[PDB]
Each structure stands twice: as C-alpha cells, then as structure tokens.
Amino acid sequence: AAQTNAPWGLARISSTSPGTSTYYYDESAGQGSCVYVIDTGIEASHPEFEGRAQMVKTYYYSSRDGNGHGTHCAGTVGSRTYGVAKKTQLFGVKVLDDNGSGQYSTIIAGMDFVASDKNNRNCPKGVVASLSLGGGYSSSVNSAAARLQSSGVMVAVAAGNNNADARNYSPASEPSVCTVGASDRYDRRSSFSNYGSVLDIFGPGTDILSTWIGGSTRSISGTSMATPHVAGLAAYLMTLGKTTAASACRYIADTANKGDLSNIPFGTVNLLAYNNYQA
Template sequence: MLVCIPHRIWAYLVFSYLTGEHIPDTPRHNGELPHEEGGVIFVDGVQLEVHPGSWRGPRKINRFVADIVSTGGHSLLNKQLLSPQVYQINVYKMHAALLLSLLPLALAAPAKRAAPAPLLKPRGAEQLLPNKYIVKFKEGTVSASVEDAVSILSAGADYNYGTVFRGFAGTMDDSALELLRAHPDVEFIEQDAVVSINEYTTQSNAPWGLGRISHRTPGSTDYVYETSAGAGTCSYIVDTGVEDSHPDFEGRAFMLASFTSTNTDGNGHGTHVAGTIGSATYGVAKATTIFGVKVLEDSGFGTWAGVIAGMDFVASDYTSRECPNGAFANLSLGGGFSAAVNVAAANMVASGVFLGVAAGNNNDDAQYYSPASAPEACTVGATDSSDSRASYSNYGALVDIFAPGSDILSTWIGGGTNTISGTSMATPHIVGLAAYLAGLLGNRGASAMCDLIRDLATPDVLSGIPSGTVNLLAFNGNPSG
C-alpha cells in the first residue's frame, strides 16, 4: 500500500518544527486547519507534542512513524480522522533533511495483514523455551522493516539472521509476540526449543535381525539405536491379534478391534509380529504404541472381506489417536492377487498410514499376490543370517526392500517367546524401522518413508537375488555401523 502525503503537509511539519509556527494557508482536513496551541501541533484532532531532548534520535522517530503507517491509522498520513486515539511524538528540533528522510519510509510502508502470522512449535520437541521465539520474514523484506520489528523487543534480538533467511530470535512477552504476528512482513514465528546430540544406545545379545539392521556388515549381536526409539508413533498390527498384556510391551500395547469370531490372539503370530515392531527386548521401535486389529482367526486364516474391514478401521482410527510422528500398519499376511485389497492398500497409504506388507512365502514373483503387489505399499522380502535371500521369499520388481526373516526370536502368547520364520517376520522389521525413523527424523509421509528406507539400505550385499529384484538390505542409519 502506498500512502500519499501532500507535500504541503510535509512542508508544514518541517516549518513548524524549525520555527514553532504554522503555515497559514495549509489546506484544511476534515474542516480543521492544522494549528499550534501551547507548543502542541494539532492536525485533524491528532496532537504532535514537542518535548525537545526526550527522544534519543531519529531511529526511534522512524520506528514511531513506521508503526503509525503500518497500522494505517494516522490522519496526517492517510487523510482520515482517527478518534479518540492520540499519538505523541517527542522530538529534537532537527534539521529539515532528517524529517524529510521519513517520507520514503512512509511511502514504502507495507499493507496491514489480514490475519496474524502463524505461530509454530517444533514437532517432537522435548523442551520448549518459554518466551523465546524465532521470527522469519518474507522473501524480499527490506532491512528497515526488520530493524523496525526488532525495536519492538525491549531487550533487542539475541541473534540476527541475514543469509539462510532474513529474521531474528529473541525474548518476547505476549504483547511483543502479538505485535510481531501482526507485522505485515513476518512470514511465521516459531517457538525456540532445546536440541541435543543424537544419543545412541546398544542392546547387547539382541536377536540377530536387530543386530543386522543396525550394522552394514553381518555378524553383530548388538542392536545400536537412537534413544527416541519411535516415540510419538502408532503401530497397527493387522493380524491374529496382539496379547497386549505381555510384559515385554511395557503397557504400550492395546487390542483395539476384531473382525473375527474372537477378540484375542489365540495363535501367536500377531503377538510375534508386534514384538518385532515394538517390544522392549525384541523390537526395532521400542517406544512406539502398539495397536492390535484382529482380522485372522486363531487358525491363521481369514477372508479378504475381513482384512479390508481391518484396513478400513485403521485408516479411520489413527486420526483420533495421539500419533504426532505418524501411523504405521503391518500386514504380515497374503493370498492370491486381489484388486479390492490392492485398492484398499493404495487408499490406506493415501490416507496417511505407512503400510508394510509381506512379499509372500512362495518363492515366486510378488506380482501374483496381494497385498504384496500393491505398488503403494512397502513390500518386504526375507533374508537369513548369512545374507542370502530366504529360500521361501518372494521376489520381483514389486519388492521394495529385504529384511531379516528367518529364525526370528520375538514375543509369543502366554507371556513367552518363540522363534519362527517367514516374510511375515521380515515385514515388522521394516514397519518398526519406519516408526523408528519417524521418531528420529519426523514423519515424512507414508509414501516417502519407504523411499527413505530404501535410500538408507545397504546395497548389493545379498546373495540369491533374481534379476529385476532390488538388492537392498534394511539399515537403521547407525552412524557407527
């Protein structure tokens, strides 16, 4: 917005400040002639009071005039009567050139914004700093506007930024924060927070699968992981159910829904999968919250109709849960190709849920099976401890990643453990890894997380990989790995 100020008004101000007298033929505004009474200049009922020496220089005058212009409220600048508000400017008797230097500032004043600038909080921050904020300005903001904003802070800025972006950081009370959010050049304000080095820990004598995904080379039984461990994530196990009372879940597991004749895990498969995802001893993401959705009978069999019902439930349920770092679903099940299941998988991912699915145990191309053939899902093949593709694992262009799947030790029903094999055991390594990475790096989106896992993976170390199938083994990014 350009504010047009008649040159005769500027001449009047300069003359008055220098001589203490008004110009008789200055035009009237709203019927009132600009005039002086007892050392106070009145224009349109707004008074400009002169107290020489009480201000310390032109910067504060610039700031005051900029404040008036940015609000669009001063009658001298926009030729509208503002009542009953009164502004006072205490000034030195200054040179005319100094006063006239305010004209470009007034003419360049930005328009008043329609809504306050967004106030953000860092995602996953463990400790926010009270009254500490980072202010980011819009591209192209001039230095004078930034300086004007900084002058709102009683203690000034702690840091000024001019290269990575234009802005500053400092201490702000509610009043200063409100003023800055109203500033037309501010893009957003973010509350400051404590950061620290990533702290990694080691689980000794861990299951071989955990040791393998945290090292580039085979043979380690130490699981090295960052201590955030999937915090803030929700992991859904769409399977035979989950024994949520198992002590290794530490109270983080909940059986939510069943689409079968029973509502507990009478098989053990789902509890084993859940343990690899997030149990304290056997899990990849040891801080994730585990939700059980039963779609398979205790015999291990079910129907596509029931599976789709479970998928539909997850896509709806997670939106009401506290999952700031994302929702992740594991489908360690499969059958022949199903268009309906693949559509459900695609839409589940589109809804925001990361979906890890088993490639299948047929030693065949995954394209013939569902949900393994759903392109939107993250399809997982299995390996053994010698870094070979497991003899039973499906393969093909639709397989995204391989993970340990043979002889996997994990939780079992009755509060116990069991060692079993299959792409069903490889898949929770990937779903757990996705939750782990989201807790560490933030949720990057359901589709992007599979890409991230592929980017981190150890390439070309697996044997027995058919042509046209990726040679990628899952890795958690351990910097010492």
C-alpha cells in the first residue's frame, strides 16, 4: 500500500533514503495487534482514529486528554493519516495529568496495569506499549518497565530530550526495553535527543505532524514523537509475523537503516527504524 503526501517520518520509515514523501506498507497494517499509549490520554473521538482508540484507565478525575501530547503520540502509532500501524487497536492509559506531569508511583502502576490488562483484550498478533515520558533515574521505574516487557509486551520508551546520555533517565535507561532516540528529516540526530549506549534505535522526532485535541492536528518535536513510530512499527511487524514482543526491538535494530544518521556520538548506535517493506 502507498500513502501519498505522508508525514516525512512515515515516509522515512519505509525508505532507504531521506527526502521522499510517500509511505509504503503492507496493507495488514497492524490489524490484530494492540498498542497501549501510556501518557496524557487519547481523544478517542478524533475521526483519525476511526473507532479503533479507547481509554482503558485513568488515575485522575477524567480520562480525557486535556493536553494533546497523548493524542499526538497515539496518532503516530495508529491514526489513519499520521500513523505507522493504521489498523492497530489503541488503548489509552492516563498516567500523566493535563499539564503533562505524573508521579513515578502512578507511572509504575500504569505499567503494571498494562501487563495485566492485556489479558482482558483481544490482541492475537501481540501487544506493544509506548511510553513517551521519563524523568531522572529510578530503579523502581526501570523495574516496572522491565516487568512489562517480561510479561510479553513490546515496550518502547523515549530516550529523553536533554541532549545528554540517557543512562541518567528512566525508563530510558532500563536495558531490557526499546529506548528510542530522535532524528530529523535530513537524517541528523535531533538537536535535543539523548544518546548513549542504552539507545536501541532512532525514529523520526523533529517536526512530526499528528493528531491533536479538539479534532485538530499539529507538528511538534521530541523523542516522544520518535517512540510511537517504533511502537507502531513493532505492532506492524508483529501482525506480519516477522517478530515477537520479546524480540521486536532486536529485530528492528537488525533490520534498521545503518550508518545513515549524522551527529551520532561515538558509542551510540547509528540505526534508524525501517520497515523493509518491498511494494
């Protein structure tokens, strides 16, 4: 399948080269997979989600996304126009308030929630969790992400936006999950992207167009935007039977575009998420 005039990041993940604008992907499109977006919520009524999004948990007075960040990330996973996996099921878990903040204890509870809640959902092709969030190093936060991964969920986490080594941030620094840095449309490391040995992969993160609240769209930047590209890619590949939740991060690294990014520090992987789709 071909989507013309796609967001540059979608085009990038199905291309051997930067500078194109058509997204190519197998029409299965993540059907039968599930992606949890652990964030500020999802505006599930947005036409771009086509009924495939729902809120399953909140820790606040509402499950509404009063911020936009979670809706934007969910749109990159699975919206019809802005999403990687355009037929996945999206599940929202609101661990962040409408200012985008959340206590680590709430974030931990949300991760343990997903590990259990997937047993209440139909996801025959597999389960992914996207965590476009983080803070300072916490062994408890990392352990929660490790448990979620161990339970059979492909966990993708943002590396962080500090232009620093991700070893000092959580859940970015948990080794067993998929830690995602950000790149721009010219295949440069995004100026804000964290780096380091713990990164597994880069995805598009500068000037990413996606859904926003109020039934709108906008373009924003962050490792928060790169992470859902990888989460959606995992769901897409799992639907295709190419990999499993336990091995999808490694498979994405194995099949990535290699050596194409600039300003990657010595010791950080030079790997850009790629679906290897041959139309």
